[PDB]
């Protein structure tokens, strides 16, 4: 209540929320993002048009001005293998590999711009696309391990290809695995390990210290990750969610360490330095990254006020069923909805005073949960100043374009 003036005072305004625009309004970001090695970029909800494009704008600014070259998104590591191929070679059909929810025009736009920047021969440093989610493990990941152990050691093939053969049909999706028994709790878990271990023994015979072998070991790890979270946790879902996000954490951090400066695109919940999804996740990736990189990890979160958006309804259908209702004046959403600006971002770290403690207290915010039902919170408590370094506020939003 008191001073929403400070928020107006330190609010670096955003002229527009359209991908193909000035991009100049984002200059304040240089010294703000500073010299961070990895940058979290979250979205309040997974189905708003303006949130997608505004994040798109920042990837644009961060790739061209701060030299970031990787874009780790909340998509399956495997699916992204076909996404990488596109931004680079232009071959393929992206919408086929994106998760139903992200099959929006905004995602295809974002991927198209990366391919364009990747086309100009002047840009000697290409932007890669990596997925950090592991909700399946398709054959693209397995052939990546096979083809390698044929170019560098066609002799181990009969040993590793035995286990991947028996692995493919049980990792095609989380249901085909969660519905096993000792198969899951044994053979498959340990087999993924025997494959990751095998490549280790013959490291010194597979161009170990090399850049392409590093990449192959990682694909193997994906099979461990998947195999790990599913089937191990029985009556303990908290472990599934926990191992799940330790995995996302692992794959982004892998990206940073081997591919360079990295952008981490995903839900606000997964990139905040604080666990705002406590009701299901014991700890989220953002915390792991922050604990590990320290301040080399900067998290920019997005927040909304008024609008409509896509979300699954109590029945299971995805569509423009969402409707923002920032009634609670104690929520960060109303207080930010007073700032008379269409779009604007503010560095929450440079706050001192009542504003500094208010930001560090705990207030409700739009949780942007994927599914809306009678027993699903639509808001959660969070210490904003402790969750994000930067915050991007967009007043009104509309449903993403899924057609």
Q: Are strands 38-43 and 297-307 parallel, antiparallel or unpaired?
A: parallel
**Experimental resolution (Å):** 2.8
What DSSP element (H or E) covers 209? none
Q: What are phi and psi of 323, to 5 degrees?
A: -155, 115
DSSP assignment of 9-58 equals HS-EE-S---SSS--GGGTTHHHHHTT-SEEEEEESSSSBHHHHHHHHHH
What DSSP element (H or E) covers 311? strand 311-312
Same domain as 320, residue 290:
yes
DSSP assignment of 324-354 equals -----TTSHHHHTTTS--SEEEEEGGG--SH
Spatial distance between the Cα atoms of 63 and 45, rounded to a whole number of angstroms: 23
> Any known ligand binding at 46?
yes
* Residue 23: partners with Cβ closer than 8 Å, 6 or more residues away: 57, 60, 61, 64
CATH number where 194 lies: 1.20.1440.30
Same domain as 374, residue 348:
yes
Same domain as 331, residue 226:
no
* Residue 163: partners with Cβ closer than 8 Å, 6 or more residues away: 191, 192, 194, 195
Same domain as 47, residue 127:
no
Both tokens of residue 46? 């997974």
DSSP assignment of 256-305 equals HHHH-SEEEEEEHHHH-SS-TTTTT-SS-HHHHHHHHHGGGEEEEEEEEE
Q: Domain tally for the chain?
A: 3
Beta bridge pairs of residue 212? none
- The answer to whether 55 and 43 have CB atoms below 8 angstroms apart is yes
Same domain as 144, residue 123:
no
Spatial distance between the Cα atoms of 33 and 62, rounded to a whole number of angstroms: 9
Same domain as 400, residue 304:
yes
> Any known ligand binding at 10?
no
Beta bridge pairs of residue 41? 265, 300
Q: Which domain holds residue 189?
A: 137-263
Spatial distance between the Cα atoms of 234 and 4, rounded to a whole number of angstroms: 48
CATH number where 101 lies: 3.30.1870.10
Angle ∠(198,147,77) on CA atoms, nearest 5: 80
Strands in 66-192 per DSSP E: 70-76, 128-133
Same domain as 107, residue 195:
no
CATH number where 358 lies: 3.40.1660.10
Same domain as 236, residue 284:
no
Residue that finishes a domain, picked among 89, 112, 136: 136
The per-type count for the chain, helices as H runs and strands as E runs, is 16, 12
Q: Are strands 262-267 and 379-382 parallel, antiparallel or unpaired?
A: unpaired
- The answer to whether 46 and 133 have CB atoms below 8 angstroms apart is no
Q: Which of 220, 192, 216, 221 is nearest to 206 (CA)?
A: 216
**For residue 127, what is the DSSP state?**
P
Spatial distance between the Cα atoms of 61 and 160, rounded to a whole number of angstroms: 43
């Amino acid at each position: 209540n008191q001073i929403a003036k400070w928020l107006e005072a330190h609010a670096k305004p955003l002229k527009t929320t359209n991908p193909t625009a000035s991009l100049n309004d984002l200059k304040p970001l240089k010294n703000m993002v500073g010299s961070a090695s990895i940058v979290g970029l979250g979205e309040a909800t997974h189905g708003a048009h303006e949130v997608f494009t505004m994040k798109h704008r920042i990837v644009k600014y961060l790739v061209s001005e701060k030299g970031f070259t990787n874009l780790v998104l909340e998509e399956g590591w495997d699916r992204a293998l076909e996404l990488d191929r596109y931004v680079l070679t232009g071959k393929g059909n992206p919408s086929q590999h994106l998760t139903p929810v992200f099959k929006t025009k905004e995602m295809l736009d974002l991927l198209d711009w990366i391919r364009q920047y990747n086309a100009n021969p002047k840009h000697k440093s290409k932007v890669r696309v990596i997925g950090m989610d592991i909700q399946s493990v398709n054959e693209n990941v397995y052939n990546n391990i096979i083809e390698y152990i044929k170019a560098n050691n066609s002799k181990l093939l009969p040993r590793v290809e035995e286990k991947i053969k028996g692995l493919i049909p049980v990792t095609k999706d989380m249901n085909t695995f969660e519905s096993l028994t000792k198969e899951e709790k044994e053979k498959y878990v340990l087999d993924a390990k025997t494959i990751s271990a095998l490549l280790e023994e013959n490291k010194s015979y597979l161009n170990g210290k090399s850049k392409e072998f590093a990449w192959i070991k990682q694909n193997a790890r994906i099979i461990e990750q998947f195999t790990t979270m599913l089937a191990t946790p029985p009556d303990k879902p908290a472990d599934f969610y926990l191992k799940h996000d330790i995995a996302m954490y692992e794959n982004a951090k892998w990206t940073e360490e081997h591919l360079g400066k990295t952008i981490v695109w995903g839900h606000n919940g997964h990139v905040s330095k604080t666990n705002m999804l406590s009701f299901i996740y014991p700890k989220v990736a953002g915390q792991h990254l922050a604990e590990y990189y320290g301040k080399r990890y900067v998290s920019i979160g997005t927040s909304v006020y008024e609008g409509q958006y896509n979300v699954k309804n109590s029945d299971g259908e995805f569509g423009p069923y969402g409707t923002l209702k920032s009634d609670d004046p104690n929520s960060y959403n109303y207080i930010f909805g007073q700032v008379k600006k269409d779009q604007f971002f503010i560095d929450l770290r440079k706050a001192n005073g009542v504003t500094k403690t208010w930001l560090n207290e705990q207030h409700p915010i739009f949780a942007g949960i994927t599914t809306e039902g009678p027993d699903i919170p639509k808001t959660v408590d969070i210490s904003l100043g402790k969750a994000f370094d930067i915050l991007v506020q967009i007043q009104k939003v509309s449903p993403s374009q899924v057609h």
